[PDB]
Amino acid sequence: RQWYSFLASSLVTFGSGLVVIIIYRIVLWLCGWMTEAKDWAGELISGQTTTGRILVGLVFLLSIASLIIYFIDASTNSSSTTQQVDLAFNVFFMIYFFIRFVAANDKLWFWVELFSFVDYFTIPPSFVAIYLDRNWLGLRFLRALQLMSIPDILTYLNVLKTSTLIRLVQLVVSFVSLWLTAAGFLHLLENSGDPFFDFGNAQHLTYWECLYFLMVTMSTVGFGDIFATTVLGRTFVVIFIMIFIGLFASFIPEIAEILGKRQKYGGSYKKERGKRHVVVCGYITFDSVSNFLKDFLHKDREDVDVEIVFLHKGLPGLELEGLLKRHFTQVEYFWGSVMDANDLERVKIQEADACLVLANKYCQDPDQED
Amino acid sequence: NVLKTSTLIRLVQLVVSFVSLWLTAAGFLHLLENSGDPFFDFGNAQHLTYWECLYFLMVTMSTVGFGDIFATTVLGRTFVVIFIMIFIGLFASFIPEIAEILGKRQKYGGSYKKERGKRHVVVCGYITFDSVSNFLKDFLHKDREDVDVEIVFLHKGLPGLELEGLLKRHFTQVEYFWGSVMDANDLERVKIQEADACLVLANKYCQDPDQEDAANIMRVISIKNYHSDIKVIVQLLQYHNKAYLLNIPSWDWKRGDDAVCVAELKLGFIAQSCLAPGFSTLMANLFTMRSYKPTPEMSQWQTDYMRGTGMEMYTEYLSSAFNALTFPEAAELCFSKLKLLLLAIEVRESTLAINPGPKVKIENATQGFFIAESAEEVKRAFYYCKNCHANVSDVRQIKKCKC
Ligand SMILES: [Ca+2]
Ligand SMILES: [K+]
Ligand SMILES: [K+]
Ligand SMILES: [K+]
Ligand SMILES: [K+]
Ligand SMILES: [K+]
Ligand SMILES: [Mg+2]
Ligand SMILES: [Mg+2]
């Protein structure tokens, strides 16, 4: 029954501000403190002031609290605790919306920025909810998109130090925020039912069934234990298929690539209480190591407990990794180079018995090798 | 003539080919399933809508295959088999090529919107996370006096993620644009008609320094062809290439056009250590912004050295209290009272005099050159009171209330 009142509250608040901006632009086309305010608000939202650094943290955390209130409203079922706290958070988001409005260079491109729509589709409906005594579930899920600010927060802080960690956190949080958002959108359409059929054609899916069904479809598994049946939910599933198969099929391999590109022979040589060790470096390969070890560890030598510690800037090939495992009790291998003082400390070379520097006897040029 | 470029041609071909084949195949399945099969006297049939067929073809060509809808006539099933063999290839090749074309778009296009009374500096040439971070931490350093200068990077490339993070940390005072100083349209975008200066950074670690110098000389030629009177500061790797830009028709050191020749400077700092051992270190530390900051792990010789590294070169107007002192008296005053080391003065055309003898007086409004920990420390020499208002010499108390 009442849904159009909540929807109208977002459309009139969007449209009226857009009209005011167009009128103001045409008036000043035909016919200082504000720059200090712009740059102050800019330093706030950029996290350059301490008050900014906070405000940004509070906007993030309260957006998560608002999202969790939406999950509770979606897993359940104006005098209620949930409508009260989510209204309080909406008032806080409205203050932050004005701070971005001040900070922005162009008011028109600001009034069409993505988070301005998240605000239009949430603050006005949250006022209407208490006014009409009706906790409408509505577009509130869109707050999940505020998760997508995490790479900016972790960049306004110096914590996200490397290009691969930046790319990793961007991929994961982009995926999760879009998946949570699209699940809320399908949940709205299927539980609404279609307007062309007077909302009679509808399904009572939970949010969690929609979240599962979107994972099952974007992976292209498509069990069909759950499926959309409204014409809006089916046209949404068609649009979702054209977009999110591309996302899943590109994101999951790039996550697997970043998680695969990790040093497996990092860490440090733990010097045993009374044993000697020899560091070995330079040309380290299955051919050099096998010929070295079969002479060094040969049974015709007297029995002496010397550990061999290979140090090399590379991953072992599978043949060498097998050979290292056959000598596990007396041979150890570390990623690194004798050119770094940190790697020399790892191999514990202060208290090695000797260091052996092996040469590539079959290099293209012996002076570069020497 | 509207579809102007090869990628827009390919884009519109892919989209409309896909949509027309998908709409056509949906009509074909709708005919077969609602017809029913002729072998069974049309008794085996389904009353699908066209829209259910259009949906079912999308659900099958994407390989999702819910099976909420499926074909049941032998003709509709053999059509679905033929459709699967053809359209899986189309979907799996078209959707990535659409995503590629939509991805290959300039993200740092657009134009510098010149704020009403702020200055800006254009920066170009070798722009990378390594060059930009080292540049910005000296340019925006807190030991300099507070001035609102915007930095506008112009470069023919997309920022790496490290540089894009650095640009976002300086969002209030640093902006970046895709483009080259070789294009008059890009020079207009960066608004270089009303920039304060243009800085042309060099790749000091290029495979060949003459190709790098030739590129940077062409950039100055381009910048000054667009507007002669912009101050250009350029980094050069070789001294003999400096002759080429001295011969540009519109290059003028009297406007402050300036070629920072890395080889000229490097070897002259080294020559100075041949005359006064270690002076290369004294003088090189003096020309980058650093602030002292002890640590408990630091040995006492390192604390002395590091306290010295915290000082750099500054310029200020000497206060009226210095007028008609000899230079030695002004230097004694600055040191013994103000804790400031006065090296030199710009004598009124004008000429720079370093440690001049008793024969020169300080004029009115003389620029002096100082060594100090920060610009805000040197401002004591400008605020320095009449002797009546600065007898106490607890130097933090020197301030603009001199009268
Ligand atoms: Ca300093
Ligand atoms: K599949
Ligand atoms: K499937
Ligand atoms: K399936
Ligand atoms: K199925
Ligand atoms: K099924
Ligand atoms: Mg061991
Ligand atoms: Mg600006």
Residue numbers in the entry:
A (entry chain C): 14 to 44, 79 to 124, 134 to 426
B (entry chain D): 214 to 561, 567 to 621
What does the paper say about this structure?
Neutralizing arginine at position R3 (R202Q) drives the VSD towards its resting state, as suggested by the rightward shift of Q-V in the homologous mutant in hBK36. The remaining charged residues in S4 (R1 and R2) maintain similar positions in the R3Q-apo and R3Q Ca2+-bound structures. R1 forms a salt bridge with D120 (S1) with a bond length of 2.7 Å, while R2 couples with D175 (S3) and exhibits weak interactions with F149 (S2). Surprisingly, R3Q channels managed to transition to an open state under Ca2+-bound conditions. This indicates that the conformational changes in the gating ring must affect the structure of the TMD. In the R3Q-apo, the αB helix is partially unfolded at its ends (residues: L374-K381), unlike in the R3Q Ca2+-bound state where the αB helix (residues: L372-R382) is reminiscent of all our open structures. In the Ca2+-bound R3Q structure, a network of interactions between RCK1 and VSD is established. This network connects the αB helix to S5 and S4, with non-covalent interactions involving residues L374-R223, R382-T211, and R382-N214. Additionally, hydrogen bonds connect the αB helix to S4 (K381-D208; 3.2 Å) and the C-linker to S0’ (K331-D86; 3.2 Å). Thus, the open state observed in the R3Q Ca2+-bound condition may be achieved through the interaction between L374 and R223, which underlies the coupling between S5 and S6 observed in all BK open structures.
